[PDB]
Amino acid sequence: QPAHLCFRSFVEALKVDNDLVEINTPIDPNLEAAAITRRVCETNDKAPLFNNLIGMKNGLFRILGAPGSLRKSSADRYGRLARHLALPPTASMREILDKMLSASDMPPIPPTIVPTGPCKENSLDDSEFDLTELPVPLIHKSDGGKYIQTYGMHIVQSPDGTWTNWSIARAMVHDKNHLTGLVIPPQHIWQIHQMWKKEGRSDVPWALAFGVPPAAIMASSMPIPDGVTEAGYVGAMTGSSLELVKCDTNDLYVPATSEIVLEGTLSISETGPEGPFGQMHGYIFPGDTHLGAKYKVNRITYRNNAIMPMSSCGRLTDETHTMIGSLAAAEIRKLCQQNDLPITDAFAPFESQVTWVALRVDTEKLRAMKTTSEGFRKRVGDVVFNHKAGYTIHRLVLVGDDIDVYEGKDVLWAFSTRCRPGMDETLFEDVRGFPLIPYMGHGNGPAHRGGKVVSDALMPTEYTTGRNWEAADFNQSYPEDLKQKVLDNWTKMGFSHHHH
Amino acid sequence: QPAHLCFRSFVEALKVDNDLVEINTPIDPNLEAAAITRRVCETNDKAPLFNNLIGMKNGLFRILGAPGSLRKSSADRYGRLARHLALPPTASMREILDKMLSASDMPPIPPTIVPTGPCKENSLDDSEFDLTELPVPLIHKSDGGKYIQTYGMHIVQSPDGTWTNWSIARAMVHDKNHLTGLVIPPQHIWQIHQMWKKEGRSDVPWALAFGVPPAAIMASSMPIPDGVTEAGYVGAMTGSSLELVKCDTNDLYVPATSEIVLEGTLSISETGPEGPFGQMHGYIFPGDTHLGAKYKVNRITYRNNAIMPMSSCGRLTDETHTMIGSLAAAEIRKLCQQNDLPITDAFAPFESQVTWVALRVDTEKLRAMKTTSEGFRKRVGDVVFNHKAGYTIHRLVLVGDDIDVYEGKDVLWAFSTRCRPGMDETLFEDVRGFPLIPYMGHGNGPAHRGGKVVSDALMPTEYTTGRNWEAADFNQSYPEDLKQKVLDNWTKMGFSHHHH
Ligand SMILES: Cc1cc2c3c(c1C)C(C)(C)CC=[N+]3c1c([nH]c(=O)[nH]c1=O)N2C[C@H](O)[C@H](O)[C@H](O)COP(=O)(O)O
Ligand SMILES: Cc1cc2c3c(c1C)C(C)(C)CC=[N+]3c1c([nH]c(=O)[nH]c1=O)N2C[C@H](O)[C@H](O)[C@H](O)COP(=O)(O)O
Ligand SMILES: O=C(O)/C=C/c1c(F)c(F)c(F)c(F)c1F
Ligand SMILES: O=C(O)/C=C/c1c(F)c(F)c(F)c(F)c1F
Ligand SMILES: [K+]
Ligand SMILES: [K+]
Ligand SMILES: [K+]
Ligand SMILES: [K+]
Ligand SMILES: [Mn+2]
Ligand SMILES: [Mn+2]
């Protein structure tokens, strides 16, 4: 099966790419596998595959760390991501994000039901597993539990059957047959949970699938619209209907080639201790346990020699930056265009710990609007900060056409030199805030409200007559024939490769 | 003579360091020398020495570009700066800035007058030079003149004789015997000019010395206090009295080993067109000419085979970032400590285009103050933004003891994750602003007032009981013995030098 449609094939692809290190000697799931993965993420090294995990029994389980993290070379920096999507490994971020948005104006391709698949090779009933006996990792030394769920997909369906959501939300082991996890507004797993709680009759039928088709895990990390079934979006994006098998103990459907599947229920009444967890902004607050949602596990099914993917998340750079930030930015680009705002590109700079999004403006279009900074900032912030796609983002930076928003140095240059603090900004206190940013949930104000800003790094003439400067740089401050002469004589004169 | 006391010896030191490229074939001062230097600055390459400059006659002049710019390796990144100060080439920024501050609590060592020096080897009177016939560079394609003065020292004295100031301010050729340049408040050349204009009797006696002792050009770029003679500060810093010779046509004194000296007057009545100039924030606004101060040149003296240093300034990284930003930050550190604020370190991040300064706080001391963010931000911003040392800086970022302010990635991480926009900030509109930042002089508000902010990236418990988090990073989220095991087995397992 192709790499973007089968996790097992994705792991092969990483090997073939010389982007995997297979570790066949014993590695401890208590901190060691995650420490190695953390180091990989902080250094952009090859992804680790732990084939000999202390505590693995009867096939459960090997671990792949850093599945969506960065490569060291600039030429294939985003290659792991490209390998989730059948794109060449040299694909740009623009190309990855356009691929993720492409299904937004396509008919869905609904999934195909098949009678069996690899995820049925092995099964354990409710008398035969114990989640405390599996090699679940402790990912950070102060975590409040062993976080089994950092790169699987939760599957829940609306009571009426009309919407099946796929999403990533963290969860940890509570006891032999339960997990606890984050289920918070405005996320779709929370929106669906609320529909079942209002009906009041039963717990939510649930599955959690690990090692799913890579194209599916990418859509699971993206804020596609309310009511849109991720499976049909992924089918349109890839051009193929995804093959799904029914769960054994409920009527949900999971990818046929899933590595590991948990089946059970998400309670509409019970909670249990959850967290703390080392998280995407780079922090853990030891001891900050709170009550989370509670999942009951009734059945495990799994592939022979099953592989569990894991995100060792925290400081730069991991899946919580490359996927959460970039895919939110993609959705925000589209949302702005659909609201008739002249936005061409959007990206969440890594330097901002993916808390900012830079919005590149088509300034010819802006000029024809005959507007001002105060008016335009308000319009952009009202659109984005009132929408779910803006949930995680606390600062929007508006920049003109000379800025490449995919280059954090250029975004920081424009922000620092073109946006006057205070006067060129609009603060938004009556919007939903993201409580997991430290300055929100552990800060001086309301954890769930406000703390957002639009910072206008457009210069005044960009609204009127056009850019009135040139950069004081090699590219813009010297004519073409001189530049070329310099470059052609560079190594001649004594001064100092793209792939590497 | 030692490198820090003689520019000619400094050039040798760069050679010996394998940090110079000598270019002995003809190079055009019209853009080509500056384009090569720009490229060097954007790539951290070796400094260029142009020995065959088109238009050089009778010894005037060779050019050294990038005298204070960065080296490519991390281990000697600041080595050019270290070579201005007799420090080892591996000196840290902390060590460089401490050396620059060391004379602040020392008695001055006043200069020594000697009867002659190398700067007297050649002379041209007022019938024998023409500034339009020298190989003065055009540094950026849109500049409003040929900027002779980008790395010399202006010398002016108070009318009462009690203060002799040395400083860098830009100047360009106006005609055969005049320059125009920037002379703006609150700079010491402007403060002295105003004392002569209030007296009303004559133009200001002036000299401009190029290729001065490197330790002297560093103090020329630093905002040491009002009324302090830079020569005696440099003498205390170096432990030696600087040797000076009298000008021929006035009673000012110039370094004996200066490469080139202009003698004349700075008018108290005349102005002439000045600018535009590609400047330290990375911009030029073509056509933005304004009236500047006007200098008359009566005499040129110079060394045999004289060398003119040049800064090809603009986008990162050059002397306007490494010297202006860092030396302002040093002075701000000291100013905060003298006002009893618990600041340990200060640096202007390059990523901010040296418009921010990050202030590291001794949080044990802060806790004993028993204060709040609102109160402490106001106190820090009142001290810094009301003082000349804060002139160029528009955002202060307060950070706790875990942050290395000399590392821009860590400053950006703390700012983005610990400072809630709006609530955790105090805006300052009734302070002097720096008009050369684009969002000031070319922006939406008053060019000369406001636009400043203190952003508090201290977390709430840093004011009360102490840091309550651990980083989600390799260093802090794993025990020491595990970390060491990982590192010792790194290359064994399959994964990937300090000097490089
Ligand atoms: C890539 C990724 C996405 C995580 C994520 C992680 C990763 C690796 C973890 C597991 C390592 C850390 C926690 N995560 C959570 C999370 N969203 C949230 O609600 N709870 C989370 O606990 N997300 C973000 C979430 O997947 C996106 O917001 C989706 O848009 C949610 O899908 P939905 O739009 O269908 O609700
Ligand atoms: C290193 C450096 C410093 C420049 C500088 C440049 C460089 C290379 C240039 C020449 C390339 C671009 C312009 N510069 C000017 C400047 N200060 C200012 O008043 N006018 C300027 O035109 N400065 C900053 C100035 O030297 C510092 O603010 C000093 O503190 C001034 O000394 P003072 O405290 O004695 O007034
Ligand atoms: O990093 C974490 O533990 C939890 C992340 C989280 C979340 F709770 C959300 F609601 C999000 F929308 C999101 F993008 C997240 F990443
Ligand atoms: O970059 C330029 O042309 C002029 C810089 C300049 C200045 F005018 C000042 F007043 C300063 F204080 C300063 F630090 C500067 F760099
Ligand atoms: K999703
Ligand atoms: K602006
Ligand atoms: K000075
Ligand atoms: K704060
Ligand atoms: Mn969804
Ligand atoms: Mn001074």
From Swiss-Prot, chains A, B:
The active site is at Q279 (proton donor). Mn(2+) binds at N165, H188, E230. Its cofactor is Mn(2+); prenylated FMN. Prenylated FMN binds at N165, W166, S167, I168, A169, R170, Q187, H188, E230, K388. Belongs to the UbiD family. UbiD-like/FDC subfamily. It is found in: Cytoplasm. Binds 1 prenylated FMN per subunit. This is Ferulic acid decarboxylase 1. Catalyzes the reversible decarboxylation of aromatic carboxylic acids like ferulic acid, p-coumaric acid or cinnamic acid, producing the corresponding vinyl derivatives 4-vinylphenol, 4-vinylguaiacol, and styrene, respectively, which play the role of aroma metabolites. One of its GO terms (cellular component) is cytoplasm. Homodimer. May form higher order oligomers. One of its GO terms (molecular function) is manganese ion binding. PANTHER family: 3-OCTAPRENYL-4-HYDROXYBENZOATE CARBOXY-LYASE-RELATED, FERULIC ACID DECARBOXYLASE 1. It catalyses: (E)-4-coumarate + H(+) = 4-vinylphenol + CO2; (E)-cinnamate + H(+) = styrene + CO2; (E)-ferulate + H(+) = 2-methoxy-4-vinylphenol + CO2. Keywords: Cytoplasm, Decarboxylase, Flavoprotein, FMN, Lyase, Manganese, Metal-binding. Its EC number is 4.1.1.102. Pfam families: UbiD, UbiD_C, UbiD_N. GO terms for biological process: aromatic amino acid family catabolic process; cinnamic acid catabolic process; ferulate metabolic process; styrene metabolic process.
